[PDB]
Amino acid sequence: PYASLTEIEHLVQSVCKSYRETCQLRLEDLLRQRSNIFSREEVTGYQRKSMWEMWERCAHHLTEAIQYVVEFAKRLSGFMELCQNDQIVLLKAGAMEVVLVRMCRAYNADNRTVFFEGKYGGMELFRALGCSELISSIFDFSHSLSALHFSEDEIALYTALVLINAHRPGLQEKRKVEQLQYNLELAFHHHLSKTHRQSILAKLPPKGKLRSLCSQHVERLQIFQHLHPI
Ligand SMILES: Cc1ncc(C(=O)Nc2cc(Cl)cc(CN3CCN(C(=O)C4CCCC4)[C@@H](C)C3)c2C)cn1
């Protein structure tokens, strides 16, 4: 019922290994490459692309991102033991939320640029999409998250808890999800206490804010998918 220190340490290690096995680019590489910024020629090139081409570019990126998140979820202890309903409930709510959180790794707060197709560019890069307000919202959320200066280990633990969330409506074995959520909270708090970083807990975004942004994101994605299916 009350996991030992050894159990908690092993869970931290498990989650962090699972995460590193399931992310595309190393954070160190994203950080190093912040100086590589799209030229004006490249930006205007992107802006002159059709809406549909830009949609394809973004949708294929998101497909890859979601695929990695699903693989991460399945590697979390206990997840594959949950009934199918609960797995689906958690993934349908949580996968795109984790995708959004993982985006902050590729966000540069110094100049409000993001990594996309080999270099950093501002929100202007995506003009052809005609989604200025939504993209601004994504940049804003990422800027707030960027302020925590997450380690990869912290992102692993935080995103585990984004997924393993017993407060999702529709769950049929809430106790089982609650148990997994608690164990993961114990892992997160242990790792933060070890590293003297517990203060970051009072700086995480409200879970509702993440859900709302996800809802707004998915709404627009469904529109593009309807107009131009991938
Ligand atoms: C290899 C690799 N790793 C990580 C990353 C990355 O996260 N970049 C990244 C990070 C942040 Cl904070 C914001 C953005 C902006 N874009 C805008 C387009 N977009 C959409 O969904 C549109 C589709 C229709 C609706 C809006 C999203 C992909 C977000 C990006 C690209 C990239 N490449």
Are β-strands 107-108 and 113-116 bridged in parallel, bridged antiparallel, or unpaired?
antiparallel
In the numeric block, the tokens 């609960």 are attached to 86
Element (H, E) at 40: helix 40-47
Would you say how long the chain is, in residues? 230
Residues with CB under 6 A from ligand 1: 24-25, 58, 61-62, 103-104, 106-107, 114-116, 126, 129, 131, 134-135, 138, 142, 220-221, 224
229, exposed or middle or buried, with CB in 10 Å at 0-12, 13-18, 19+? exposed
- What structural domains does the chain harbor? 1-230 (1.10.565.10)
Angle between helices 51-75 and 5-20 (to 10 degrees): 150
98 with 215: CB under 8 angstroms? Answer: no
Max distance between CA atoms of the chain, in angstroms, equals: 60
Query: How far does residue 98's CA lie from ligand 1's centre (Å)?
Result: 13
Could you count the other beta carbons within 10 Å of the beta carbon of residue 150?
Answer: 20
Among the listed residues 215, 86, 88, 103, the one whose alpha carbon sits nearest the alpha carbon of residue 159: 103
| 175 alpha carbon – ligand 1 mean position (Å) | 35
Q: What is the CA(197)–ligand 1 centre distance, in A?
A: 28
Q: Under DSSP, is residue 180 helix (H, G, I), strand (E, B) or coil? A: helix
